[PDB]
Scaffold this active site. Structure first.
Site, PDB file in Angstrom:
ATOM      1  N   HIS A  68      -4.247   0.886  -0.574  1.00  0.00           N
ATOM      2  CA  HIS A  68      -5.122   0.562  -1.593  1.00  0.00           C
ATOM      3  C   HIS A  68      -4.016   0.796  -3.023  1.00  0.00           C
ATOM      4  O   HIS A  68      -4.443   1.743  -3.740  1.00  0.00           O
ATOM      5  CB  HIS A  68      -5.976   1.351  -1.863  1.00  0.00           C
ATOM      6  CG  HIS A  68      -7.392   0.835  -0.561  1.00  0.00           C
ATOM      7  ND1 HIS A  68      -7.570   1.256   0.366  1.00  0.00           N
ATOM      8  CD2 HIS A  68      -8.073  -0.270  -0.761  1.00  0.00           C
ATOM      9  CE1 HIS A  68      -8.409   0.421   1.095  1.00  0.00           C
ATOM     10  NE2 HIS A  68      -8.951  -0.455   0.091  1.00  0.00           N
ATOM     11  N   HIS A  72      -1.371  -4.231  -3.332  1.00  0.00           N
ATOM     12  CA  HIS A  72      -2.804  -4.898  -2.979  1.00  0.00           C
ATOM     13  C   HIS A  72      -3.301  -5.288  -4.405  1.00  0.00           C
ATOM     14  O   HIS A  72      -3.930  -6.479  -4.363  1.00  0.00           O
ATOM     15  CB  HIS A  72      -3.660  -3.533  -2.302  1.00  0.00           C
ATOM     16  CG  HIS A  72      -5.044  -4.060  -1.912  1.00  0.00           C
ATOM     17  ND1 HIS A  72      -5.334  -5.070  -1.319  1.00  0.00           N
ATOM     18  CD2 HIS A  72      -6.168  -3.750  -2.860  1.00  0.00           C
ATOM     19  CE1 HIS A  72      -6.269  -5.206  -1.125  1.00  0.00           C
ATOM     20  NE2 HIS A  72      -7.208  -4.416  -2.248  1.00  0.00           N
ATOM     21  N   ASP A 107      -9.143  -1.681  -7.673  1.00  0.00           N
ATOM     22  CA  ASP A 107      -9.062  -0.359  -6.787  1.00  0.00           C
ATOM     23  C   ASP A 107      -8.437   0.790  -7.566  1.00  0.00           C
ATOM     24  O   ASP A 107      -7.879   1.476  -6.768  1.00  0.00           O
ATOM     25  CB  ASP A 107      -8.348  -0.817  -5.274  1.00  0.00           C
ATOM     26  CG  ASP A 107      -9.079  -1.515  -4.245  1.00  0.00           C
ATOM     27  OD1 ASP A 107     -10.416  -0.689  -4.126  1.00  0.00           O
ATOM     28  OD2 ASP A 107      -8.639  -2.201  -3.709  1.00  0.00           O
ATOM     29  N   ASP A 217     -10.162  -9.894  -1.820  1.00  0.00           N
ATOM     30  CA  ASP A 217      -9.754  -8.588  -1.348  1.00  0.00           C
ATOM     31  C   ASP A 217      -9.602  -8.449   0.130  1.00  0.00           C
ATOM     32  O   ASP A 217      -8.751  -7.500   0.484  1.00  0.00           O
ATOM     33  CB  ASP A 217     -11.079  -7.844  -1.703  1.00  0.00           C
ATOM     34  CG  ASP A 217     -10.803  -6.147  -1.582  1.00  0.00           C
ATOM     35  OD1 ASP A 217      -9.821  -5.977  -1.997  1.00  0.00           O
ATOM     36  OD2 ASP A 217     -11.996  -5.745  -1.083  1.00  0.00           O
ATOM     37  N   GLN A 269      -9.771  -6.123  15.477  1.00  0.00           N
ATOM     38  CA  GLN A 269      -9.421  -6.938  14.469  1.00  0.00           C
ATOM     39  C   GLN A 269     -10.454  -8.130  14.792  1.00  0.00           C
ATOM     40  O   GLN A 269     -10.988  -8.763  13.959  1.00  0.00           O
ATOM     41  CB  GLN A 269      -7.876  -7.342  14.581  1.00  0.00           C
ATOM     42  CG  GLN A 269      -7.268  -6.304  14.033  1.00  0.00           C
ATOM     43  CD  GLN A 269      -7.089  -6.150  12.609  1.00  0.00           C
ATOM     44  OE1 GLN A 269      -7.319  -7.132  11.863  1.00  0.00           O
ATOM     45  NE2 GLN A 269      -7.388  -5.054  12.111  1.00  0.00           N
TER      46      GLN A 269
END
Ligand SMILES: Cn1ncc(C(=O)N2CCOCC2)c1C(=O)Nc1ccn2nc(N3CCCC3)nc2c1
Ligand SMILES: [Mg+2]
Ligand SMILES: [Zn+2]
Length: 313
Positions: A68, A72, A107, A217, A269
Site C-alpha cells: 500500500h 500502488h 490509499d 485498485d 488466488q
C-alpha cells in the site's frame, strides 16, 4: 503553457495499454502521472506548479509498506487513465479531473493493515470511523493536503464545481473498500440485465465509478504474469505481517493472513479471481465494452494460477 511532458518511445506507446507497468524508477512516477493528467484532462486542468507540489506532498504521505505504497497509488491512477482514454466521451470534465486524483490519493497514509485489524487493535481511527475506516482516513488526508498553502489544484473551479469534484473523490475513495464492492456490483449486475441502468442518473454514475475504482485498485491481476506474481509477494508480505500482529493480540488470523498456510496461496488466488476479480472485470466490460482487455488479462492470470496448482509452474 507550451510545456508538454513527454516520455521515451517505449513508455509513450505502452502507457496507453491497460497492462502497462510503471517500472522500478521511482523518480519517473510523478512525470508519468503528470503525463496522464495532461492527455486525459488537458495542460489547462491544473497549474503545473500547484500540481507538482500536490504530487510531492501526496508521495510524502504514503508510507514504506510492501504493497500500500506510492507505487500502488500511481499504478491505480494509470489503470484509471487507461479506462478514461478508452471511453473518451462517457465522462464529464470534472470526473476526468477528480478520478485520477482520487486514484493517486486512495490509499494515503496506509499502514499495511486491514480495517478489521484496526478494529481488533482498538486503533483511534476505528473510533472516529466505524466502517470503511481506512478509506475515510484516506479521504481525510486528501482534503488535508488540498488545504496546504500552494496545494489547491482545484482553485479555478466555482464553489459548486469544487464541491462536486470533492464529492466525486470522496465516493471514489470510499468505493475502494472491498466490503462495499460485492453489493455495488450485484446492483450494477441487475440494473444492466433488466436494462434499468441509466448513466444520466447520478446514483447510477456513482455505482459505475465505484466499480471502476475496484477495477483500478485490483489491476495487479490484469498485468503480465511476472508482474502479477511479484505483486502477490508484496500483498502476502503485508497480509502475513497482519497475521503475526493478530496472533500478538491472541487471535487466530484468517487464512489469507496466516504465513503457516503459504502452501494454499495458489488456491486462495483462485477463490479471489473467481469471487472478486473476474466478476468485477466482467460487469465492467458489460457496462464499458472497451475495457475488455482487463477481463481478458485477468482470465489469462487465473489460468496461470491454475498451472501453478497443477505443477506446470
Ligand atoms: C491479488 N490481489 N489484488 C488485490 C488483492 C486484495 O484482496 N486486496 C488488496 C490488499 O488489500 C486487501 C484487498 C489481492 C489478493 O491476493 N486477494 C486475496 C484474497 C483472498 N485470499 N485468500 C488467500 N489465501 C492464501 C491461503 C488461503 C487463503 N489469498 C488471498 C488473496
Ligand atoms: Mg485501500
Ligand atoms: Zn489500493
Amino acid at each position: 503553457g507550451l510545456m508538454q511532458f513527454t516520455l521515451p518511445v517505449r513508455l509513450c506507446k505502452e502507457i496507453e495499454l491497460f497492462h502497462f507497468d510503471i517500472g522500478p524508477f521511482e523518480n519517473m512516477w510523478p512525470g508519468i502521472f503528470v503525463y496522464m493528467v495532461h492527455r486525459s484532462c488537458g495542460t489547462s486542468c491544473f497549474e503545473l506548479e500547484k500540481l507538482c507540489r500536490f504530487i510531492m506532498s501526496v508521495k510524502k504521505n504514503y508510507r514504506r509498506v510492501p504493497y500500500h505504497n506510492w507505487k500502488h497509488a500511481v499504478t491505480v491512477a494509470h489503470c484509471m487513465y487507461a479506462i478514461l482514454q478508452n471511453n473518451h466521451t462517457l465522462f464529464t470534465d470534472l470526473e476526468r479531473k477528480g478520478l485520477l486524483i482520487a486514484c493517486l490519493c486512495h490509499d494515503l497514509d496506509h499502514r499495511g493493515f486491514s480495517n478489521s485489524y484496526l478494529q481488533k487493535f482498538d486503533h483511534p481511527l476505528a473510533a472516529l470511523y466505524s466502517t470503511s475506516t481506512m478509506e475515510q482516513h484516506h479521504f481525510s488526508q486528501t482534503v488535508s493536503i488540498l488545504q496546504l498553502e500552494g496545494h489547491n489544484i482545484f482553485s479555478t473551479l466555482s464553489s459548486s464545481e469544487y464541491e462536486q469534484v470533492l464529492e466525486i473523490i470522496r465516493k471514489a475513495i470510499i468505493a475502494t473498500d472491498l466490503a462495499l464492492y460485492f453489493g455495488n456490483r450485484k446492483q450494477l449486475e441487475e440494473m444492466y440485465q433488466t436494462g434499468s441502468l441509466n448513466l444520466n442518473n447520478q446514483s447510477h454514475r456513482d455505482r459505475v465509478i465505484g466499480l471502476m475504482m475496484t477495477a483500478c485498485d485490483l489491476c495487479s491481476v490484469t498485468k503480465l504474469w511476472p508482474v502479477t506474481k511479484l505483486t502477490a509477494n508484496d500483498i502476502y508480505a503485508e497480509f502475513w505481517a497482519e497475521g503475526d500482529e493478530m496472533k500478538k493480540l491472541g487471535i487466530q488470523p484468517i487464512p489469507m493472513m496466516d504465513r503457516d498456510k503459504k502452501d494454499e496461496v495458489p488456491q486462495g488466488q483462485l477463490g479471489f479471481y473467481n469471487a472478486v476479480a473476474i466478476p468485477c472485470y466482467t460487469t465492467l466490460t458489460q457496462i464499458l465494452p472497451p475495457t475488455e482487455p482487463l477481463l481478458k488479462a485477468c482470465r489469462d492470470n487465473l489460468s496461470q494460477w491454475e498451472k501453478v496448482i497443477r505443477g506446470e509452474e
